[PDB]
DNA sequence: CGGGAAAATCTCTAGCA
DNA sequence: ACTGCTAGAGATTTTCCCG
DNA sequence: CGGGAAAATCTCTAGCA
DNA sequence: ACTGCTAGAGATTTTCCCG
């Protein structure tokens, strides 16, 4: 399992940690609180 | 029969990129085309490239200039 | 390092030092300091420094709206070639966008369209137009203009050309069509030293020609190749190598350890 | 290189065009073009036809690419010179338009259309058109119920005609045919450019008299002299500009 | 090419084609097409793709104002080291900026300050403060933030650190001072694996030490070197090479063709 | 002599041609109509 | 390497500290430090003094670095704990402050100052200060007419004291002296870090008993055993962690 | 006398940049310091660098670790 | 096999809400 | 489960041209 | 002299009105 | 006559450790 810290959309404040549901080249799908989200890999960090 | 078609399909040129390299690689030699992947021959190296990352042309300027 | 680990953790809970500071000031191995930093939720404030790569299949189009002199210009681009279409539309409505996309689909083989989440692109009319024309709509990540970088760049380019021809036209629609003409046929460059129109013609013709040629090759050349496995389909034998496809995996093997039936 | 004489023999007997010779015998296009241009026994993509159709009280401007039958049709608010000029400018920005044939109407003669054609470099001249314009009306009748406005039905009909109707020798569609034709014309233009660039040179070989250069290869130079094509080594030939 | 040149010029006066298009369509040499493009005033719409490099002398400071939660933070940075100072000021006035700069000059050897053209930095009070303290003011190109990139980046960094410590303080001035502390002494990196405070101490001490050491060397070692010229002053002889200074030009020559007196 | 085409300051429209008075690394000094100006080399082109 | 015995002889006779030995004989600092630490015959930068000065009805908080006499003085609106804590936090963010000595005043004892010192890791303890505080008043009297407000005059006096007044053995200023002292303390801290890192290792050479590692060079290993320092080849020694 | 001072001034490390290269070059060896220019020794190459482009340190971490 | 000149490639930036 | 790019301006590297 | 592991360096991006 | 930078996250290249 992984921890995801992300910046969602035009919001300077970083969220996290979120569960990584899917990883691709250039983006990821995260579940941060029964809220599935898709984030560019520029705006995310996976640990 | 088959050899002519194979030579013709090898006459096509392919420009491609790798998963993390933003620059376009030069005109590789097309060897095989499929629904999702393209098999190319670039500088003695046989590669499989995603179709989403390949621009396949013929280059009509070079074909007319042998 | 246990005692040093407690001191480093207590110091980081206050100053949030980077891994180098705690490695230097507490005699810690770099991995331990990096772990201490990585266990802090308040220190994860940066993403990985890379860009993605947009799809470049011959059927992909990117659509956007730009604004100039109070007018709205709907601009579409063919990602593979850089060929553009642009129309000055009275308003950013679903009707106008649906009409533009339906007219574009009837002039070129449009398979998928990549747009942002603007209200005009997400209307039910545009959805119905795409459904009728067999176009797949792809909105990427909301508020991520980079996913449409191609069309965005074209916006820039288009406006640039308009600034060069605005004095030759009395209306902005005329200048927009002149700019489309100039970009598509009066600017050469790119992969093949082409213009956008020449390049798109080459792309589409190459797509159809290669598809038919490979269809003929596969119809005529039928073989089964065993390497190291099951009956993998032969794709291309030559130059002391065999490219095959075993279980939806196109792989290259040396000519050795490969028998063709 | 070895197939030049075979190419001359093939053209003398079968009279094949330069593209077939270059494909079969693997010659540069300039050599095959000059082979077929040396036979005194031997010796369209850019034209469009414009028309207007009146349906349900509205005006549809239809442009047909006659080499392929490719239709581009738009409903216009009024049959005026400004609308015709805008339509022509759009057409010229979309496709390589060089000639348009019109029926000497009031709108097609106006000075705005003349100015647009002059800016876009289009030549204006005053049964493909009728056949396509009737087929378009048939398709519009078929698909009228699928749309509310007439313009949407017209664009749907254009889509169906260009990509959903197939026929001819090879069973291709109008879009496929027009891309093939335009690609062939691009090849023709590049070959003409190459010939024009090459024609300003002269070659001295073995020295013999001035000769016409055909191809400048990596390790060979193909030239013509006295209506005969010969290949000479690069070091054995000198090329000058005159 | 004369006729081709006239056709290319007439075509460019309408479409403004790039040099490749006119080279291809009129059989022109690339230099001729490039000249035709370069003679058009309407086609010069792009600058050279490079960045400059800011001065990095040990006495250079960059000052800027940033805003956070309705408060104004005046931030100064030492370019060589990355050492920062920051104060929450009630207003962007000449009085406050002059006081801040006068206090900064009395704590570190400030020689020149690099600021933008904000009204607070260009006031007569700041000018008088700099004149009294012997500081040279350098406003660069107006509305060019890149010339102050260092301080601009520090702004970013400073705010980042504040976002990590804002919960530990009840007032923004306390959080700003905590952030200054953390940046200056709790973050290690850069050229020497230093913190900002360690690096600035190293920079200043190295400056004074090297200046005195070179003064002693020049006082003791006095020689005149003739190469190939006049009596050039010897700078450094060694490793089969001689560095000398002839007529305000420090040049390196081989040991050969060099006589030392 | 040189011709300078420049973008002066937060104005998208390019000016020129201007006489080059001085050239440095990263910037230039131009005289565009009895108006001496200093422009970053990012915002200028010299011919 | 060859100067180790000469270093021991020099310390035995002249008793020079490790820095002078390392400078003269070109030794790694750990070797010279252990040489001077092996002589049983043988065997401040981070302290500041805070005070308050009342002048013209206003309060000036003055912090003096006593190793150099470096003054940092600010006029504060009120003699309260909050102002003192803010001043201390600024001082600690500017310079490496480890200890402050105060006169057990009401403001210096308040819980806000204690919290600020705890956060910044400063130890609080309850004639340099008086001398500097009188010199500051003299300079303020000199430069009062050059400014309107008292705070500007105080900062001008601080500037003059730190950089325009010179004296001592070498004729340096307070700023120069404080940078030298802080640089020396940085060197001391890095040497202590190196010694602490190295001390957790043991060396077996030629095998002999466990030995203390001193330096791990490119082609040599300097160790100590039985109160005697010896250099052995890298291949001839094995290093383990205990 | 002089040799000790020359060795000491050569003990200092210099980081520098070139007129059009944005990346910082490694710790060259200081050979000479002046008002406007600095003479350095980087990888067997003797260079003259503007003082405006040079950060001259000692690196006290490396000095204490021989 | 080799300099000078020219063509090709590499590097890098603004602007695209 | 999705994804920065593009055209131009210098600068530097490669290729060609005739000895 | 050589693999595995670790340290060092290179690449590259957001944010700084 | 002046001038983008900085710190962190991966990825790849270099060095060290003991045979
Ligand atoms: C209301 C719709 C839907 C949701 O988002 C908004 C806002 N937006 C913003 C930009 C923009 O930021 N351009 C600058 C830019 C920056 C970076 C980059 F890589 C590419 C770039 F073009 C657009 O282009 C755009 O079309 C929109 C838009 O349409 N909308
Ligand atoms: C009224 C004063 C005087 C004149 O100019 C204005 C406007 N301005 C704009 C930015 C700014 O654009 N930051 C973003 C950014 C963009 C690029 C880059 F390289 C660095 C960057 F920080 C500032 O920081 C800033 O201080 C000012 C300012 O102060 N003023
Ligand atoms: Mg956009
Ligand atoms: Mg700023
Ligand atoms: Zn943290
Ligand atoms: Zn132009």
Residue numbers in the entry:
A (entry chain J), F (entry chain D): 222 to 268
B (entry chain I), H (entry chain C): 212 to 277
C (entry chain G), E (entry chain A): 1 to 228, 236 to 268
D (entry chain H), G (entry chain B): 2 to 44, 57 to 139, 149 to 228, 235 to 270
From the manuscript:
HIV-1 and other retroviruses integrate a DNA copy of their viral RNA genome into the genome of the host cell, a process that is mediated by the virally encoded enzyme integrase (IN). Each step of DNA integration, up to formation of the integration intermediate, occurs within a series of stable nucleoprotein complexes (intasomes), involving a multimer of IN and a pair of viral DNA ends. Because integration is an essential step in viral replication, intasomes are targeted by an important class of antiretroviral drugs, the IN strand transfer inhibitors (INSTIs). INSTIs work by chelating the two Mg2+ ions, blocking the active site and inhibiting the strand transfer activity of IN.
